[PDB]
Amino acid sequence: EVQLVESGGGLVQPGGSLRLSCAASGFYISYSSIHWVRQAPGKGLEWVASISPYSGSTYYADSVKGRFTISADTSKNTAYLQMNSLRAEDTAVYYCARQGYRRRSGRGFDYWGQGTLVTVSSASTKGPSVFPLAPSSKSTSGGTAALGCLVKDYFPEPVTVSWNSGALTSGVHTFPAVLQSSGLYSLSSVVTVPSSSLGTQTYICNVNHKPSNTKVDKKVEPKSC
Amino acid sequence: SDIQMTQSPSSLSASVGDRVTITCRASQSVSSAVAWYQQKPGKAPKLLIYSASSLYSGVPSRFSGSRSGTDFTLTISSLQPEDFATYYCQQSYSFPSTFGQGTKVEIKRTVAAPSVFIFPPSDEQLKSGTASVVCLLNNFYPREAKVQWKVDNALQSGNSQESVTEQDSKDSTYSLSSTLTLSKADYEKHKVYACEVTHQGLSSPVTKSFNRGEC
RNA sequence: GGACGCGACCGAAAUGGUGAAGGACGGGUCCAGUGCGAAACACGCACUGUUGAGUAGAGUGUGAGCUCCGUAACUGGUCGCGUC
Ligand SMILES: CC1=N/C(=C\c2cccc(Br)c2)C(=O)N1C
Ligand SMILES: [K+]
Ligand SMILES: [Mg+2]
């Protein structure tokens, strides 16, 4: 029944501003402390800010003090994080969490939202180029063949990849994106298949990058050579 | 002074059914205001323990917490398949709050050598001015692996990037992709492109290569 | 000897003034800690702490007691005198 939904995340340039929302349901935030916690990709949890009940006292992590402002609108049962003077290292998934009721959960955060991604970068939004990773002319190495798609130079995160509209799932590996020195992301999706049906079976990678209106399907076939 | 929560180990390998313990050590007294969380890839953290030693409602009792001064431990008496994830400690004795750096708990299994594939850049990417060369290490264990790029037998450095998948939910292996990035001009100045893989499961180093013009 | 009556002295409940005492005279308040109120701070309650706190009070008590100077009910005591 209890639920927290954060929104307002997205792409912002350094020095820019951004306001996150934390919509509570199944409970009333006025009776709880509400917290903001963030997680840079591949990194641990970092406590950001909190606001106390009845007093409205606010506390902030040193790394965001003077830049961030936490607040709450009981009329909408929503909490907010106003972020000013944003920096590259502010890039993270932002969670809002409810501090539980002292008698039942102490000071533990018993409920978390799914999180909203904030990307701070001077890079422009850009759809990816999808290139084929063709199955080799050779037919060995594992008893099967390997193929895939290179999803290069998109921004920002995230992107989705499927194969044959979701019909092909087995033996699929979609790797975590990498941030290139250009400021753009890049990743690969590969799948191992029986080398005996390479020219027969159809293999299409389905790439969707919502932030750029870029949805692409690429057929991957053995190169002519 | 900010209160430090020094968590260890940073990573941990264990078999299903094993008894494991994770430690967080505070830099000063945090009383008993310590919580433990479980987090799985792409999901929000979940509360396990509060007040150092109290089991949060609905959490299985194989999870336990204890306090020994300013040292705090999370113990899983007998790991189950769904228990493999990352765990974080947190002090909430005073502001600002502090999370531990976390501990990733991964599943142990028999050594598995990687299957290695190399992919030359597509002709479509080449007409763009950039050449991406991809090397795949498929389904191996343990996670530790070494990928080297050779161009005409010259060791590359600083011009490639790696990415590794989460431990697989079925075979508990890892996969890895390395991408060598070159200008179209530099790419066409050389012939033999290779990546040499070294892994514990390999009887010896494995080289996958192609010649630029041939395929 | 005793009783009644008057006076003095002593004693005395009560009471006004006075000035030293700080926690072993207290209460109030503040502070620290812990728990509780949907509650980490702020607000309120409960518990704990004076090797937590001014006897210049920092009290919409400086309250009780005491030190010291008075008024004083009267059941008291003693002495003198008058009378029986
Ligand atoms: C300074 C001070 N101390 C007080 C009370 C108190 C009570 C018991 C022991 C001690 Br020490 C002090 C008080 O009320 N104040 C203003
Ligand atoms: K007092
Ligand atoms: Mg209080």
Query: Which residues 6+ apart lie within 8 Å of B90 measured at CB?
Result: A45, A47, A109, B5, B34, B35, B36, B37, B97, B98, B99, B100
Assess whether B123 and B59 both reside in one domain. no
Domain membership of residue B162 as a residue range: 110-215
Residue B106 CA: distances (Å) to CA of B13, B17, B45? 5, 13, 17
Distance between the two ends of chain B, CA-based, in angstroms?
62
Shared domain for B199 and B95, answered yes or no, is no
Nearest Cα neighbor of B151 from B214, B198, B212, B213 is B212
Report the SS3 class of residue A210.
Answer: helix
A96 and A41 within one domain: yes
Q: B212: helix, coil or strand?
A: coil
- Which pair of tokens denotes residue A182? 């250009």
Q: Which positions 62-81 of A are in contact with B (Cβ < 8 Å)?
A: 62
Is the same domain home to B119 and B214? Answer: yes
Residues B93, B140 within the same domain: no
The β-bridge relationship of strands B103-107 and B11-14 is parallel
Calculate ∠ Cα A48-A51-A55, nearest 5°.
Answer: 155
Amino acid at A30: S
Q: Which residue, A66, A95, A122, sits at the end of a domain? A: A122
A102 touches strand C (CB under 7 A): yes
Q: Return the structure tokens found at B92.
A: 């909430």
Distance from residue A19's CA to the centre of ligand 3 (Å):
32
Token readout for B179 is 């991408």
Statement to judge: residues A24 and A99 lie in one domain:
yes
Domain holding A35, by residue range, is 1-122
Q: Which parts of chain B are beta strand (E)?
A: 5-8, 11-14, 20-26, 34-39, 46-50, 54-55, 63-68, 71-76, 86-91, 98-99, 103-107, 115-119, 130-140, 145-151, 154-155, 160-164, 174-183, 192-199, 206-211
Do A87 and A190 lie in one domain? The reply is no
Question: Which residues of chain B lie closer than 8 angstroms to A177, CB-CB?
Answer: 163
Q: Is B17 left (phi over 0), alpha (psi -120 to 50) or beta?
A: left
A181 and A88 in a common domain: no
SS3 for B30?
coil
The single-letter code of the amino acid at B91 is: Q
φ and ψ at residue A185, rounded to 5 degrees: -95, 160
Domain CATH for B121: 2.60.40.10
CA separation for the pair A210, A157 (Å, rounded): 9
The reply to whether A30 and A136 lie within a common domain is: no
> A41: CA distance to ligand 1 center in Å?
56
- Do residues B207 and B194 make contact, with C-beta atoms less than 8 angstroms apart? yes
Contact B135, B164 (CB under 8 A): no
Task: At A90, give phi and psi (nearest 5°).
Answer: -90, -5
Do B10 and B91 have their domain in common?
Answer: yes
Distances, alpha carbon B203 to alpha carbons A31, B112, B125, B194, B198, in Å: 62, 11, 36, 19, 9
User: Exposed/middle/buried for A105, CB within 10 Å: 0-12, 13-18, 19+?
Assistant: buried
CATH number of the domain residue A144 falls in? 2.60.40.10
Number of domains in chain B: 2
Task: Please tell me the total count of domains within chain A.
Answer: 2
Q: Supply φ then ψ for residue B6, to 5 degrees.
A: -90, 110
Residues in chain B with CB shorter than 8 Å from the CB of A134 are 119-120, 122
Domain boundary among B75, B109, B143: B109
Report, in ranges, which bases of strand C sit under 7 Å from a protein C-beta.
34-43
Residue B54 has which token pair? Answer: 């109290």
CA distance B178 to B116: 11
Q: How many residues does chain A have?
A: 225
Report residue A171 as tokens. Answer: 């033996």
Cβ atoms of residues B37 and B100 within 8 Å: no
Q: Say yes or no: A1 and A95 in one domain.
A: yes
The verdict on B54 and B130 lying in the same domain is no
Give the span between the Cα atoms of A51 and A65, in whole angstroms: 14
Asked whether residue B97 falls in the same domain as residue B114, the answer is: no
HSE at residue A135, side-chain half, CA atoms within 13 A, is 26
Contact A191, A200 (CB under 8 A): no
How far is residue A130 CA from its own chain's centroid? 20
CA dist B211 to A41, B47, B128, B167, Å? Answer: 37, 54, 20, 33
* B35 touching A (Cβ < 8 Å): yes
Cα–Cα distance measured from residue B75 to residue A51, given in angstroms and rounded to the nearest whole number: 31
User: Which of A73, A101, A122 delimits the end of a domain?
Assistant: A122
Distance of CA B146 to the CA centre of its chain: 15
Distance of CA B160 to the CA centre of its chain: 18
Supply A26's token pair. 């199944």
Determine whether the distance from the CB of B94 to the nearest atom of strand C is below 7 Å: yes
Query: Do residues B60 and B156 share a domain?
Result: no
Q: Identify whether residues A116 and A129 lie together within a single domain.
A: no
Residues A21 and A112 in one domain: yes
Residue B58 approaches strand C within 7 Å at CB: no
Same domain, A131 and A101: no
- B179 CA to C15 C1', in Å? 104
Cis peptide before A14 (omega within 30 of 0): no
The verdict on B165 touching A (C-beta cutoff 8 Å) is yes
On whether both B2 and B105 belong to a single domain, the answer is yes
